[PDB]
Design a protein around this ligand. Structure first.
Ligand SMILES: O=C(Nc1ccc2nc(N3CCOCC3)oc2c1)c1cccc(-c2ccncc2)n1
Ligand SMILES: O=C(Nc1ccc2nc(N3CCOCC3)oc2c1)c1cccc(-c2ccncc2)n1
Ligand SMILES: O=C(Nc1ccc2nc(N3CCOCC3)oc2c1)c1cccc(-c2ccncc2)n1
Ligand SMILES: O=C(Nc1ccc2nc(N3CCOCC3)oc2c1)c1cccc(-c2ccncc2)n1
Lengths: 296, 295, 295, 295
């Protein structure tokens, strides 16, 4: 309600009739994936990140409307240094759009991969980013919220490479741990998800796991999944290291000249604790926060 | 023309061959190959110092042949796109070679962004392709085969001028002989040409292998990766030639100035180099001409 | 917030603050009246540590005041285009500030091609310019004045991302109250606007100085040169405006890719920065918009 | 036996002598007075066609005499540090000279990094100095004076081999019976020795002007700059000789690999060259020997 209500044809323009070409070459479309497509725009002189929702999977009306509702609803209460900022939205012209503040460095995912040829993130920059992400999450768990879709792709970077969590559409209003809560409709990103999450069980323990996957993604500079790589899953490296088959040293990203063993292995151990298969044998976000704060 | 070096000079200038990486204040630049190179300083000039090491695979006298050959070829061949040899060390029998240091290391490394270097642009990638393609021309013109064209050997100076290093396996060719063989295989397999693996030495082998480097330039992927499907880069060429994937699927996303035409032009050249039939391949002069015609 | 260091730590990481030049296996990177700087490795991360050498110029208190003003602004401000302070070492005397190292040094030196570096070409010279303008904007958003904009204080990282450095002389402005004064004038005279030299303080003094920098980019000439006519770069603008000379003449010849429209565009910016009435200048927001509107 | 070309044959390869720079698809590589240099292609061979041009100063016969002289020398003199002629065109009333193309232009240009070429290191320069010196020694071994030795006329090949050029003003000499005189007077002021400027002729003069080229190499500064203090280069010898400045003040900073023991050696020779009293200067063979002993 405090968020500004745009009209659809107020922001179809700024997005350049939603120009499907990238910034690289003329057009607007910055990022795809999820349940829409994120374009750039220009309002109040400034740049912004617009997201036109669209039905790729889950082809049903109110579903995407409720995730839209959820996105907004969450963003109302939740505000933090390590969370994105919604400026407004657009429901009229029934194509659900969302206007945010522009993050000039986009996803952690992309900046690890160096998509469009960006410089490789130094160890030191990542350390901060890992701490930042963990902090933003802690706020959600404090404000009793589960994200249900934590991944590099949903962790974005401002003008100073500040980790800010994004996409609270699948986020769930939670309790302490009432008792074990469930869904029939299971949703999330497979390579990142916790086992119980993959069994439809909902819990703030499940977002800890997936952050483990990010902390690895960071250390290795390898995504959680790749259909042309053995092992296809990053996750599987844990057991490789856990069976002394290789060390973490072997997997440390080589696109860095500022990495050291102590910090790396500290960030490994933390990441492994998150990825402990017993949901309840894992540490809580705050314990993680601490561990990362201690690392430096 | 060159310069002799008491071993200690070379030891000292490299902090007694500081095995620590140069990326963290050490002196070691790279290993493997044949020996191990260190970033040194000789009379204020920064140099490279390939200190050879004895591997149970090559003889202690077979390693002289290579040490000799490296020198033999240099003496004749000086070129803007070929690394320079200042001197050497036969004394301290461990055998170090002293070259002019190359501030941007290997193409391979910079294709990987090793130690956190920025990803090379397409435009810059073209200059490098053109660089080595001239550098090879000078070898064929001077009746020489390299026998190990790899991005590991295509080094870069402070302006990214490509210069071919490591003439340990180089030989001498003469005219339309062909079928010329050996009883000992040597080279880096992910780049080597089919016949070359058989021993069959010929300048046309170098073309094929340059063909492989052009892929590495376009894809940003090494010729071999053990943790990848398919582990050898050539397989891709067939996926593209049979249309399962396209050239576009394997463009390096770690650049953003790479237009579709010149990239599909550079691929054509690599395809033509990587002809299964050796004699349908273009000799370096055509490659070089197309690489001109590209930009 | 920042890791306050102790004592020796920074000495031992800097080879006892070894004074030798980096380009010949030394430890000293740069110098100035403010103090001296060295390259150091702190836990594998390379850093720039500035050990503060006092002169006849300023006293303990003044020197400390500047040592603090860095931290106060750095506490508030971190940015892509603003260098990154990691810590400090106030214990004892001499004083140290720690930053993240910047592998391509200052804009002034890569314009001068100091230590055999290649000459930055026009496209890089815009990126850098466009970068520097962003850093200035963020300070002017945080209501801060730099009071010493120059190419020496615009450093270049691995990827030549331009970052604004050094905030000893930095000051916090107002929204729009009134022009401010001081009894001790400060900075590098070659860049400093007339008012700034009169002890005046205003956001638009940084603009003017940034205007000078842009000439240093376009021409490749420093802001001043003892052995050159005219010794001050600022003079050549009037020689262009009163058209005894063309900006065309003064363009840097250590590059090939410059084109007239974009170069005259950057001088069209540099001109408006260098207006004599401080108010007739456009604010950095405009400048930034122009440098963007260029490419 | 040089090939005799048709003026049309040479107009073809140059595209009617296309006046643009090659940057924008032209053929003009440079000029000066004497004539103009165009880029060309015959039998693949990149070539440097030199279309002689009349500049209010020379009669069509005074220019022809230099045309005849250029060839007269080339015919007799062949050295790996002297540029190579291939032919000419007398018919078509323009007069032309076809030399093998030099892919790294002049010494002058590269010192200046013209068109953004990377700065030449100390090492390269030393090599170059030697190369240039040896060619002169060949000229004087076949009793000849160049009479216009400058950076410009020293050109650089694909391995940066120093080769001297333009012998239109080269004169035939003997075993120094007496000194020769003229009533011309030819040459380029900033490089010319006093007696040369007085209209004397001798091989002593080339030696002096080589000194000027050596400084240029140490300094990376041209023999003259009308916007510089001192405008001449050879005055620096005085400032050095009167210890007002040091040679170490003037070393070109666009290297990273200079050293005192070798640079101060080069200066010592360079000074001997510039000895006001001509006869006190050492014969080129010495210069050569000295330069040889410097490495
Ligand atoms: O800024 C955003 N996103 C982005 C993505 C991608 C981006 N790529 C860049 N670049 C510049 C720097 O150069 C590389 C390209 O900036 C990029 C920015 C943003 C900001 C706020 C919310 C949301 C979002 C919410 C819900 N669902 C999806 C997204 N997104
Ligand atoms: O400079 C060389 N090599 C190198 C390797 C690795 C290097 N890594 C860096 N850097 C870290 C990354 O940042 C840039 C500096 O510089 C690097 C430089 C060099 C130079 C001359 C000959 C030869 C050579 C010859 C025969 N056989 C093998 C090699 N090599
Ligand atoms: O990297 C820095 N500085 C530098 C200087 C000189 C340098 N020369 C080189 N190189 C040799 C030549 O080759 C390229 C690298 O890298 C050089 C780097 C740096 C980094 C961060 C802050 C500050 C600084 C702050 C406040 N006041 C002054 C400085 N400085
Ligand atoms: O190659 C020559 N000359 C040249 C000039 C200028 C050149 N500029 C380039 N390049 C653009 C810049 O990049 C490098 C290549 O190559 C350049 C080459 C040459 C060769 C032989 C004789 C003579 C000559 C003789 C009598 N009078 C005048 C000249 N000249």
């Amino acid at each position: 309600t405090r968020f500004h209500s745009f009209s659809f044809y107020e922001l179809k323009n700024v997005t350049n009739n939603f120009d499907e070409r990238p910034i690289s070459v003329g057009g607007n479309k910055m990022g795809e994936g999820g349940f829409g497509v994120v374009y750039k725009g220009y309002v109040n002189n400034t740049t912004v990140a617009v997201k036109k929702l669209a039905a790729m999977v889950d082809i049903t009306t109110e579903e995407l409307k409720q995730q839209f509702d959820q996105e907004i609803k969450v963003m109302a209460k939740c505000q933090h240094e390590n969370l994105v900022e919604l400026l407004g939205f657009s429901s009229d012209g029934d194509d659900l759009c969302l206007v945010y503040v522009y993050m000039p460095n986009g996803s952690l995912l992309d900046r690890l991969s160096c998509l469009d040829g960006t410089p490789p993130l130094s160890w030191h920059m990542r350390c901060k980013i890992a701490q930042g992400a963990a902090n933003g999450i802690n706020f959600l768990h404090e404000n009793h919220h589960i994200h249900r879709d934590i991944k590099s792709a949903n962790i974005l970077l401002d003008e100073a490479f500040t980790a800010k969590i994004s996409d609270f559409g699948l986020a769930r209003a939670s309790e302490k741990f009432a008792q074990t809560v469930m869904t029939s409709r299971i949703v999330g990103t497979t390579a990142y998800m916790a086992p119980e999450a993959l069994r439809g069980e909902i819990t703030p323990k499940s977002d800890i796991y997936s952050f483990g996957v990010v902390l690895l993604e960071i250390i290795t500079g390898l995504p959680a999944v790749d259909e042309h790589r053995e092992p296809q899953l990053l996750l599987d490296i844990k057991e490789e290291i856990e069976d002394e088959e290789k060390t973490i040293e072997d997997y440390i990203d080589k696109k860095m000249n500022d990495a050291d063993s102590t910090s790396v292995e500290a960030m490994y151990s933390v990441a492994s604790q998150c990825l402990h298969e017993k949901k309840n044998k894992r540490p809580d976000i705050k314990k993680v926060q601490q561990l990362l704060q201690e690392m430096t």
